[PDB]
């Protein structure tokens, strides 16, 4: 009664029609990341051809899609970079712990949208308290990796990485986007370095760390 | 002079008159319509062995 396979073939007949949704293909999304479906590309083929011909897109179903592309470590850049349409027009309709799985998403895919990281940049100054430091850092990752060099929110997001100090994965995110950026600020890094003895869950955040230590050519830790 | 009586349209020029058009059959709009819905079978169906589906919106693999 435990099937994965035959709950494969489940989800292949339901985008494999003619009119699915935005809801239909987001959780077909999320759920192939759940059971880990890097096997199977076509199924994740079939699931981003419907993700560009959904037309409606609330903001629950865009960044539950758009959190199962990155996680899921899927990429296919004309279809992802067209999610930035529903985006920028549900940027206002957008919860802060939601913006920052789209920004993070849309800007790790490489996704040249000066608009979208304008405005949600300009979201995320606005109201900066509103932010916890895993979204201010996510939004980071998103306006470095998607071309701008948005020094406005380094700044902003340096504030806050002093006052509160964050997670280890929040902080090895925060690292790498300022790697990219290219700032060596050493207010912000040694308040961010200080998260990473504390025990560390992912191998991915301590290599990533690794890597904006030595792009900015720091020290060890 | 008995010509002059008889009627001077002739039997060719009332089948002509008559049957001017070469009249439509009922069928060559059955059979005109199906072999071009066929092409609209061909193409569009997604049982076909030709289908443009992977011709305009090719897959995503």
Same mark, same amino acid.
């Not at chain 1, 758009?66 to 470590?73: C, E, M, Q, R, Y």
């Not at chain 1, 979208?116 to 308290?129: D, E, F, M, P, Q």
């Not at chain 1, 895993?134 to 306006?143: D, F, K, Q």
């Not at chain 1, 990796?145 to 100090?165: M, P, R």
């Given at each position: 009664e435990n099937d994965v396979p035959a709950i494969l073939k489940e989800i292949d007949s339901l985008v494999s029609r003619e009119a699915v949704s935005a809801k239909e293909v987001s959780d077909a999304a999320v759920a192939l990341t759940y059971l880990q479906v890097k096997a199977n590309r076509r199924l994740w083929g079939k699931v981003l051809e419907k993700a560009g011909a959904a037309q409606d897109y609330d903001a629950a179903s865009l960044t539950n899609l758009l959190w199962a592309i990155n996680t899921g470590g899927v990429e296919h850049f004309k279809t992802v970079a067209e999610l930035a349409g529903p985006a920028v027009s549900l940027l206002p309709s957008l919860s802060p712990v939601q913006l920052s799985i789209v920004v993070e998403a849309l800007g790790g895919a490489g996704v040249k949208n000066y608009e979208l990281y304008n405005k949600a940049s300009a979201v995320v100054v606005s109201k900066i $308290?509103?932010?916890k430091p895993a979204e201010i850092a996510r939004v980071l990752y998103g306006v470095a990796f998607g071309g701008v060099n948005d020094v406005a929110l380094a700044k902003a997001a340096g504030k806050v990485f002093a006052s509160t100090e964050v997670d280890s994965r929040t902080a090895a995110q925060a690292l790498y986007a300022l790697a990219k950026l290219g700032r060596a600020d050493k207010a912000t890094v040694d308040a961010l370095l200080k998260?990473?003895? @504390? $025990?560390?869950?992912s191998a991915s955040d301590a290599a990533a760390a690794s890597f904006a230590l030595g792009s900015l050519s720091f020290k060890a830790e | 002079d008995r010509v002059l009586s008889l009627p001077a349209v002739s039997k060719n020029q009332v089948l002509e008159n008559v049957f001017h058009t070469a009249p439509k059959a009922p069928v060559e709009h059955l059979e005109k319509m199906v072999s071009a819905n066929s092409k609209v079978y061909d193409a569009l169906? +997604?049982?076909? @062995?030709?289908? +443009?589906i992977w011709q305009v919106k090719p897959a995503l693999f």
């Amino acid at each position: 009664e435990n099937d994965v396979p035959a709950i494969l073939k489940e989800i292949d007949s339901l985008v494999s029609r003619e009119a699915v949704s935005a809801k239909e293909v987001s959780d077909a999304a999320v759920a192939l990341t759940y059971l880990q479906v890097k096997a199977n590309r076509r199924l994740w083929g079939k699931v981003l051809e419907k993700a560009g011909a959904a037309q409606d897109y609330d903001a629950a179903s865009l960044t539950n899609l758009l959190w199962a592309i990155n996680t899921g470590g899927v990429e296919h850049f004309k279809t992802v970079a067209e999610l930035a349409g529903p985006a920028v027009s549900l940027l206002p309709s957008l919860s802060p712990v939601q913006l920052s799985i789209v920004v993070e998403a849309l800007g790790g895919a490489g996704v040249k949208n000066y608009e979208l990281y304008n405005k949600a940049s300009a979201v995320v100054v606005s109201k900066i $308290g509103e932010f916890k430091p895993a979204e201010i850092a996510r939004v980071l990752y998103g306006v470095a990796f998607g071309g701008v060099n948005d020094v406005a929110l380094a700044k902003a997001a340096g504030k806050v990485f002093a006052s509160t100090e964050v997670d280890s994965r929040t902080a090895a995110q925060a690292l790498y986007a300022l790697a990219k950026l290219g700032r060596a600020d050493k207010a912000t890094v040694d308040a961010l370095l200080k998260s990473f003895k @504390k $025990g560390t869950e992912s191998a991915s955040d301590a290599a990533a760390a690794s890597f904006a230590l030595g792009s900015l050519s720091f020290k060890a830790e | 002079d008995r010509v002059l009586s008889l009627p001077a349209v002739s039997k060719n020029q009332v089948l002509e008159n008559v049957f001017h058009t070469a009249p439509k059959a009922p069928v060559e709009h059955l059979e005109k319509m199906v072999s071009a819905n066929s092409k609209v079978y061909d193409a569009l169906n +997604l049982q076909s @062995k030709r289908v +443009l589906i992977w011709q305009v919106k090719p897959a995503l693999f």
